[PDB]
Ligand binder design. Structure first.
Ligand SMILES: Nc1ncnc2c1ncn2[C@@H]1O[C@H](COP(=O)(O)OP(=O)(O)OP(=O)(O)O)[C@@H](O)[C@H]1O
Ligand SMILES: Nc1ncnc2c1ncn2[C@@H]1O[C@H](COP(=O)(O)OP(=O)(O)OP(=O)(O)O)[C@@H](O)[C@H]1O
Lengths: 551, 570
């Protein structure tokens, strides 16, 4: 089982930049444990002082030291807790940011295949578990180890013979625990089988009730359920009896070791090698020491059990995108010649079912090229291929005698822009959504774009002008207002190749055509998608696409 | 509530014994510190050794007896709890199964009643042990307070006074930490929401190449949550510090006041040692009670859900007491109108009136829908008619005994279900008395199922899984027909029992309907799409829209030249 080991190694590598916080927390934990373990020793010192002749100075000194050590231990414990919580929060924030940055670079097919709810579940839930995994287990392990070492050091300081007598106890306890666990696993398996068999009959009876009521066999099912419950109860009683017997033998062993230690300590005190306070402190230490070694021996399984809630996100970060390497071509000579040569495309999510069957066409800078066809023909696929959102399975595309995938990612989309079929709006303001994807811009350009898209008429009705807030996913404007906003957002960049996937549009695109010939300026290539041929009729080049074939 | 005491009262003889054992064990388990202090004080007074060995033996005996008594009491309590849990599970299932068919037709919620009963398991355990852990500890605490108060009233009064100051102050402090945690959670939720919004529009965020914008807008959100995280850490640190120091200073205070008492001469050092050993156990018991209480509070709060199913009132007439020893089987419909109680706005049946007599076969025919199977569902008392009357031998259906009525009327439905058990048990399903093998063979022969039963390697004892996946459709039809024929019913309903059957099964059904010698004591309502069986029927009833338009024999309906003629020609 090396998968859990490599997962824990990945978690440690992720938590690496939090070394000073963990070191300080460990130091404070050591200080707190050392301060706490001195309390019973000073209690024994006080008890020994009270017996015999009195001495007020020693009593006052002991009480003062008790108070000082308690104060120091409490302060160190508080500091340790604060440090651990802060490192939890830091790890959570770092892993959330890393996962989002890794997920932002995946291909479109991965998002089409996966679901938004699954991504939300992975992002908002598993990261908290990853953050909680390391510091909690580290705190538990360090506390147990330091407590065990300090307690046994104090045993050795007080008396070694009683320490050996205490150490003789462990192997019988370990063997009994192992045997009890081995029997309990089998009993639990039998319990699960019996309860599944019992639930089967109630499921079957509640399923086909009409047939049961038709024959009047209602009490028969109740009797069968009672018969199953009898076996379930018998197995439950057997399990409880086993647990009670194990608890009894553990208690008997603890009593035996306690009585032996008490007798040996009394014999030693009779000889004069011990005192009453030392014996009391030894009893307190003996009471305290067992649970820590139990936690120490179980902590490995406890830690390895919780790792299995972080492999999904690591797999998500480790997924390889199916995208070509980005180019480095950013020229200023981009007059806008676009060519499609034998382009045939198949969706990666649904392969061997092509929608494009060897397109080949040429675009022009000053002229207008329109694409027409019926629903389901796949014009949006042609637009997506022109926007370099997918790779062609055959043929090639050329942008000014260069393949489109060899251009810079940021430069290409600042020159080839597209008004989408269904505009999507974000939670930002109107000005933030108009200048989306732009590092900086001026108000005059935004106003000119609003005027060109005929969106400035309703931009003054709302308060604060273009700085008006927009609802979530743009759930504040009308469909025509959203379309005008999208058109202005596309026109802000002043592109060279402009795709307009109008298709299903209700913005009276007759006004858009009458604005200036579908935004054609004589130096900007325009490709407009229309549902019916009669809707444009003024494009210089017209292409009809049926079943993935040009006409 | 009082219902828990009501269902637990059947055992208040064993519970008293359990309580006595618990108090005896708690009394006996505390001799160790007392004898430690006594023996140390005896050493300091240089006494004898006969008292030493006597005290050692006494303490050992007391502790052994305490452990044994605890084991016995735990066994008794576990046995009684298991018994009452099984009884409660049986009672809740029996109460669930008594509800009317309208409650169960919501098969989309079917798993709910396949879950709520199982909830009574996971609730009961959550109350079985916690109530023990409370009960096993409180008296234990009450035992400790019975000894320190005997030791010296001053120290126990002091620890009683300052117990709330150490066990309520962290609860008051933790409100700040909890509200800060809530704020942090809501900020993280908002950040996750904006991340999901950015991720859900990937094509339009790649069309403009604004992944860096989304990364910046996501980092900006976390930069604000950083400060809330810092405040969270500070509040948690303060809470940890106070919950440590408040509990730690009590020991120093106890030691100081005890030293003052010992120097005064009221008590000796051994009493101080015993008190020091008792105080830690008392604190542990109090903390255990405080931890236990909310869980049992949640359990008793959630227990009210089960009683809702337990005492839900059935919306159906009660079973009658009539059980005649001689039924003719005559069935009369008197203007029966029925609407489904789920949607009572639609009258599925309206103006139905016909009479079925023994020895005569009535064929009900019509198109899809039109309430063909609703008449069959009404006939076997699965629903009550909204209007009109249903008469069986001069008496209404609810007046008869439930088991006797369902034994005297048998039906084969559209989709017969076969439960998972032995094959010969499915044939005799629901029979009060187990029939002989000869009767089962006769029923298999009558339905024609005996041809393929003997071909099975295990014979009639072949086990069947759920849903009858081990058999084909025709075999399921044959086994359903044989199951419905085993009791020799007085009224036989065959609704779509001749749909996906073999030709041999069709011949067997046709022979049973008309040429079987035992047909004279049977009245048959047949719903089928085969005209050969329809033509030989004595009365033919056409159903369309829940009303009868064409009725009579085959020749009269042929002469009518109406809907039945069109159906025949089609
Ligand atoms: N994400 C996708 N994954 C797989 N197949 C897709 C995907 N999107 C679209 N398709 C399919 O590929 C073809 C492309 O259709 P597309 O939506 O591009 O048509 P269109 O002619 O542009 O018209 P419109 O979009 O107005 O319906 C269709 O057969 C469609 O079912
Ligand atoms: N539980 C119900 N609640 C309301 N309406 C129901 C219910 N069960 C059935 N119905 C409707 O009442 C009518 C009863 O038709 P019925 O089942 O008797 O027709 P059928 O000819 O036997 O065959 P089929 O089931 O194919 O329609 C149908 O319109 C059906 O949709």
């Amino acid at each position: 089982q090396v998968n859990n080991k490599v997962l824990m190694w990945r978690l440690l590598k992720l938590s690496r930049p939090d070394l000073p916080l963990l070191v300080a927390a460990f130091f404070f934990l050591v200080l707190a444990v050392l301060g706490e373990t001195l309390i019973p020793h000073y209690s024994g010192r006080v008890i020994d002082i009270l017996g015999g002749d009195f001495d007020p100075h020693a009593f006052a000194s002991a009480i003062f030291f008790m108070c000082l050590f308690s104060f120091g231990s409490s302060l160190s414990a508080g500091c340790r807790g604060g440090c651990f919580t802060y490192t939890m929060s830091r790890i959570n924030l770092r892993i959330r940011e890393q996962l989002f940055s890794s997920l932002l670079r995946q291909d479109l097919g991965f998002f089409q295949e996966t679901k938004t709810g699954e991504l939300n579940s992975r992002l908002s839930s598993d990261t908290t578990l990853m953050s909680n995994w390391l510091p909690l287990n580290a705190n538990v392990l360090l506390r147990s180890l330091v407590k065990v070492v300090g307690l046994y050091g104090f045993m050795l300081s007080i008396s070694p013979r009683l320490t050996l007598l205490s150490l003789l106890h462990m192997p019988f306890t370990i063997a009994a625990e192992k045997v009890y666990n081995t029997r309990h696993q089998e009993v639990l398996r039998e319990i699960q089988d019996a309860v599944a068999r019992a639930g089967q009959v109630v499921r079957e009876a509640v399923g086909g009730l009409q047939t049961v009521r038709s024959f009047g066999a209602e009490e028969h099912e109740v009797c069968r359920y009672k018969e199953a419950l009898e076996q379930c109860r018998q197995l439950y009683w057997r399990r409880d009896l086993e647990r009670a017997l194990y608890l009894l033998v553990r208690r008997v062993l603890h009593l035996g070791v306690q009585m032996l230690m008490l007798s040996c300590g009394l014999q030693q005190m009779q000889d004069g090698e011990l005192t009453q306070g030392s014996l009391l402190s030894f009893m307190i230490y003996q009471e305290s020491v067992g649970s820590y070694v139990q936690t120490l021996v179980y902590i490995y399984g406890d830690m390895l059990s919780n790792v299995g809630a972080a492999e999904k996100v690591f797999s998500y970060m480790d997924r390889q995108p199916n995208l070509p390497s980005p180019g480095t071509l950013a020229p200023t000579t981009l007059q806008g010649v676009v060519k499609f040569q034998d382009v045939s495309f198949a969706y990666p999510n649904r392969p061997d079912r092509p929608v494009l069957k060897g397109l080949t066409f040429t675009l022009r800078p000053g002229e207008v090229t329109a694409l027409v066809g019926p629903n389901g023909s796949g014009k949006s696929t042609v637009a997506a291929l022109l926007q370099n959102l997918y790779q062609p399975t055959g043929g090639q595309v050329l942008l000014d005698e260069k393949p489109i995938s060899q251009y810079e990612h940021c430069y290409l989309h600042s020159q080839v822009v597209s008004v989408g079929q269904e505009p999507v709006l974000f939670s930002g303001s109107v000005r933030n959504n108009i200048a989306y994807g732009l590092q900086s811009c001026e108000d005059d350009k935004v106003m000119a774009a609003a005027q060109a898209a005929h969106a400035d008429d309703f931009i003054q009705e709302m308060e604060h002008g273009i700085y008006t807030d927009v609802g979530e996913k743009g759930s504040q404007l009308a469909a025509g207002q959203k379309q005008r906003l999208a058109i202005a957002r596309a026109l802000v960049r002043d592109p060279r190749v402009l795709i307009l996937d109008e298709a299903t549009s209700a913005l009276d695109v007759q006004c858009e055509q009458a604005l200036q010939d579908w935004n054609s300026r004589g130096d900007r290539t325009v490709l407009v998608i229309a549902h019916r041929l009669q809707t444009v009729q003024r494009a210089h080049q017209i292409l009809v696409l049926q079943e993935g074939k040009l006409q | 509530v009082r219902r828990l005491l009501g269902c637990l009262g059947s055992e208040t003889r064993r519970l008293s014994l359990f309580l006595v054992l618990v108090v005896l064990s708690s009394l006996g388990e505390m001799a160790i510190p007392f004898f430690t202090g006594r023996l140390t004080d005896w050493i300091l007074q240089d006494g004898s050794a006969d008292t030493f060995t006597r005290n050692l033996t006494l303490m050992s005996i007391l502790t052994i007896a305490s452990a044994v008594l605890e084991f016995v009491g735990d066994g008794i309590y576990n046995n009684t709890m298991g018994h009452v849990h099984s009884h409660l599970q049986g009672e809740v299932f029996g109460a669930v199964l008594r509800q009317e068919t309208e409650f169960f037709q919501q098969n989309q919620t079917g798993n709910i009643m396949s879950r709520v009963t199982e909830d009574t398991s996971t609730l009961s355990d959550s109350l079985s042990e916690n109530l023990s852990l409370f009960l096993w500890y409180l008296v234990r605490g009450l035992c400790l307070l019975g000894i320190m108060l005997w030791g010296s009233v001053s120290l126990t009064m002091v620890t009683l006074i300052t117990l709330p100051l150490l066990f309520l102050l962290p609860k008051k402090v933790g409100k700040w930490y909890q509200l800060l945690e809530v704020q942090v959670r809501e900020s993280l939720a908002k950040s996750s929401q904006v991340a999901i919004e950015a991720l859900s529009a990937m094509p339009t965020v790649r069309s403009f190449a604004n992944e860096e914008g989304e990364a910046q807008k996501f980092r900006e959100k976390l930069q604000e949550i950083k400060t809330l995280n810092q405040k969270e850490a500070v509040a948690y640190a303060v809470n940890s510090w106070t919950t440590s120091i408040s509990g730690m200073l009590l020991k120093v205070g106890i030691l100081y006041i005890g030293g003052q008492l010992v120097t005064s001469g009221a008590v000796s050092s051994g009493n101080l040692v015993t008190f020091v050993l008792y105080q830690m156990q008392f604190t542990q018991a109090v903390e255990v009670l405080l931890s236990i209480y909310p869980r049992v509070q949640k359990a008793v709060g959630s227990s009210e859900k089960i009683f809702e199913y337990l005492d839900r009132t059935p919306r159906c007439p009660p079973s009658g007491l009539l059980t005649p020893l001689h039924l003719e089987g005559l069935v009369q419909f008197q203007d029966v109108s029925f609407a489904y109680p789920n949607r009572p706005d639609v009258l599925v049946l309206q103006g139905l009136t016909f009479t079925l007599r023994p020895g005569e076969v009535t064929a009900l025919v019509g198109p899809n829908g039109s309430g063909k199977s609703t008449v069959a569902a009404l006939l076997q008392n699965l629903y009550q008619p909204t209007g009109g009357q249903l008469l069986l031998d001069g008496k209404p259906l609810p007046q008869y005994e439930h088991r006797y009525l369902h034994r005297q009327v048998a039906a084969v439905g559209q989709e017969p279900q076969v439960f998972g058990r032995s094959l010969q048990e499915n044939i005799a399903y629901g029979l009060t008395q187990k029939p002989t093998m000869e009767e089962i063979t006769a029923a298999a022969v009558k339905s024609g199922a005996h041809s393929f039963i003997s071909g099975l390697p295990q014979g009639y004892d072949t086990e069947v899984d759920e849903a009858g996946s081990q058999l084909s459709g025709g075999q399921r039809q044959a086994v359903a027909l044989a199951r419905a024929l085993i009791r020799k019913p007085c009224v036989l309903i065959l609704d779509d029992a001749t749909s996906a059957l073999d030709a041999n099964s069709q011949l067997q059904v046709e022979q049973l309907l008309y040429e079987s010698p035992e047909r004279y004591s049977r009245s048959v309502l047949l719903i089928t799409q085969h005209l050969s069986l329809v033509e030989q029927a004595d009365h033919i009833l056409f159903l369309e829209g829940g009303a009868i338009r064409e009725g009579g024999t085959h020749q009269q309906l042929m002469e009518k030249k109406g809907c039945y003629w069109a159906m025949v020609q089609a």
